[PDB]
Design a protein around this motif. Sequence first.
Motif, PDB file in Angstrom:
ATOM      1  N   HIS A 175      -6.050   6.431  -2.786  1.00 27.12           N
ATOM      2  CA  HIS A 175      -6.894   5.428  -2.156  1.00 27.12           C
ATOM      3  C   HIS A 175      -8.037   5.030  -3.039  1.00 27.12           C
ATOM      4  O   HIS A 175      -8.489   5.806  -3.876  1.00 27.12           O
ATOM      5  N   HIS A 220       1.480   4.055  -3.027  1.00 23.63           N
ATOM      6  CA  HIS A 220       1.376   5.517  -2.937  1.00 23.63           C
ATOM      7  C   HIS A 220       2.603   6.150  -3.594  1.00 23.63           C
ATOM      8  O   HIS A 220       2.480   7.155  -4.295  1.00 23.63           O
ATOM      9  N   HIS A 272       0.863  -1.193   0.000  1.00 22.26           N
ATOM     10  CA  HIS A 272       0.000   0.000   0.000  1.00 22.26           C
ATOM     11  C   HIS A 272       0.901   1.245   0.000  1.00 22.26           C
ATOM     12  O   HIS A 272       0.675   2.203  -0.754  1.00 22.26           O
TER      13      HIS A 272
HETATM   14 ZN   LIG Z   1      -2.857   5.189   2.210  1.00 22.62          ZN
END
Ligand SMILES: [Zn+2]
Length: 199
Positions: A151, A145, A141
């Motif tokens: 998201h 990014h 995750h």
């Molecule tokens: Zn995040």
Amino acid sequence: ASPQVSVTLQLVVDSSMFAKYNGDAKKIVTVLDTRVNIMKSIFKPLLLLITLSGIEMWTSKDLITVKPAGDLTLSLFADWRQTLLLSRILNDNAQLQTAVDFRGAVVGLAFVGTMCNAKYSAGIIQDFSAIPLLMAVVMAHELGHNLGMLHDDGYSCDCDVCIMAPSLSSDPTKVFSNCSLILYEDFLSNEEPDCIDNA
Ligand SMILES: [Zn+2]
């Protein structure tokens, strides 16, 4: 989501995590390799190879002050990578692994769309679960990014249990939503991260 790319990823293990694992370097390595192997499966669909440039363990001392305030720790860690790590270990991104319990429910932090950047291609991860899958998803995750992913809009995107969900699911998929794939295509197109496309 198609040209063949590669991220040379450097992991860093702080004193707290080193101690949590009873100062056993072999145990820690095996643990992180299991997680990185799942991370490799997570990125496989995007044709992005993850290779470890190393796992640096701060066995004697922390090279930065690892603070429960995640924001502060990410900033300090990213700078240390810029000024100290990159002079010794060339890498496209470094990710701190720590046993420090960040304040609040934050278990990871990273800068967005900074992959390859000398000062901000970084992320931090709290060793919050012993389950390999859950930690690999957490690591992925943050790297996502770094790779320009925002998201997942849980309602709009084609997945509500995927990597870029705002909160880690209790039982996560290794899958990226359609939204995440589009964001990665945009990052490649608009940002053109040369370091992952090299030879
Ligand atoms: Zn995040």
